[PDB]
Amino acid sequence: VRLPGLAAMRQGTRLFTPEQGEDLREALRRRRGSFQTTCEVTSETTFAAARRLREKASALAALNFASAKNPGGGFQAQEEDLCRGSGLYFSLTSPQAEPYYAVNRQSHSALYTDHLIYSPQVPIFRDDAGQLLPAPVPVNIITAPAPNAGAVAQSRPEQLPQVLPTLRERARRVLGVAAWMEQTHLVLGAWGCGVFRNDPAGVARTFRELLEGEAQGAFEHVTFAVLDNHPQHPTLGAFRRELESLCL
Numbered sequence: 014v015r016l017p018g019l020a021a022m023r024q025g026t027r028l029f030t031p032e033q034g035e036d037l038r039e040a041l042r043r044r045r046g047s048f049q050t051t052c053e054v055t056s057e058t059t060f061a062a063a064r065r066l067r068e069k070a071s072a073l074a075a076l077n078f079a080s081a082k083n084p085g086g087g088f089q090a091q092e093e094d095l096c097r098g099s100g101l102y103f104s105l106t107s108p109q110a111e112p113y114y115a116v117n118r119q120s121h122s123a124l125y126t127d128h129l130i131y132s133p134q135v136p137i138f139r140d141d142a143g144q145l146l147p148a149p150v151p152v153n154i155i156t157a158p159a160p161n162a163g164a165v166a167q168s169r170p171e172q173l174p175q176v177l178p179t180l181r182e183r184a185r186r187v188l189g190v191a192a193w194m195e196q197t198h199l200v201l202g203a204w205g206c207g208v209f210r211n212d213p214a215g216v217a218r219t220f221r222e223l224l225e226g227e228a229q230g231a232f233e234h235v236t237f238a239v240l241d242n243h244p245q246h247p248t249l250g251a252f253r254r255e256l257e258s259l260c261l
């Protein structure tokens with residue numbers, strides 16, 4: 014059996030190549046200035062925030078903190094959760110999307126490449142607790158690996174100064190894909206700040222410079238769903254301070 018919605022999701026999954034980084038920056042240009050973007054930082058899981066925003070949102074995308082070598086990352090982690098409660102993994106393994114993992118496997122570097130996976134209308138089937146929803150809710154998803162900072166530190170430390178130059182260059186492509194497919198509502202988060210070991214305050218600043226810069230106004234509403242189980246909330250806190258300008 015195939016679960017409803019999946020067939021059309023796999024058909025519509027498209028790949029964005031490194032050479033299309035130019036056309037993705039033009040897409041930001043055409044969307045810049047469209048809304049008076051309002052912004053918020055919540056302690057939600059990516060899918061919880063998505064469902065919350067679903068009703069009011071015209072076009073709703075979520076960012077998957079993906080692995081660069083395995084669909085679902087080989088399985089705590091956000092991509093592992095997206096795959097338990099939705100249709101993601103059937104879209105990430107679609108034949109058309111395989112160059113993303115193929116090239117990244119040859120890559121030789123823990124910075125990875127600038128392939129992205131857009132998956133339209135990914136049904137969320139289950140809530141955080143693992144219970145089925147009375148009906149599935151669709152959410153478009155953008156898949157991009159943040160550079161593995163921890164793998165870099167162990168293998169090519171001469172590459173550490175390019176970690177942030179990659180995170181920026183790549184977060185601009187994510188927002189590029191999102192403007193490209195004319196999304197109104199984004200759920201972002203602490204991309205690369207767990208298993209991949211980048212600093213949260215660094216990632217959060219990156220996004221900020223983008224949303225007051227090349228992507229200022231490209232989106233109606235951007236939610237940072239940072240799930241942070243620790244009592245003193247380090248990852249979450251960094252996103253609140255570094256984004257307190259934009260949520261006011």
Ligand SMILES: Nc1ncnc2c1ncn2[C@@H]1O[C@H](COP(=O)(O)OP(=O)(O)OC[C@H]2O[C@H](O)[C@H](O)[C@@H]2O)[C@@H](O)[C@H]1O
Nearest residue numbers: 058059078079080086090091094203205206207208209240
């Ligand atoms: N369901 C969730 N929803 C929202 N935020 C979450 C969630 N889970 C964790 N966070 C927060 O997001 C932060 C980072 O989540 P991480 O999963 O490490 O993504 P990465 O980009 O660092 O690593 C990607 C690789 O790790 C995976 O294995 C992939 O398969 C790849 O192999 C966490 O600290 C949480 O605060």
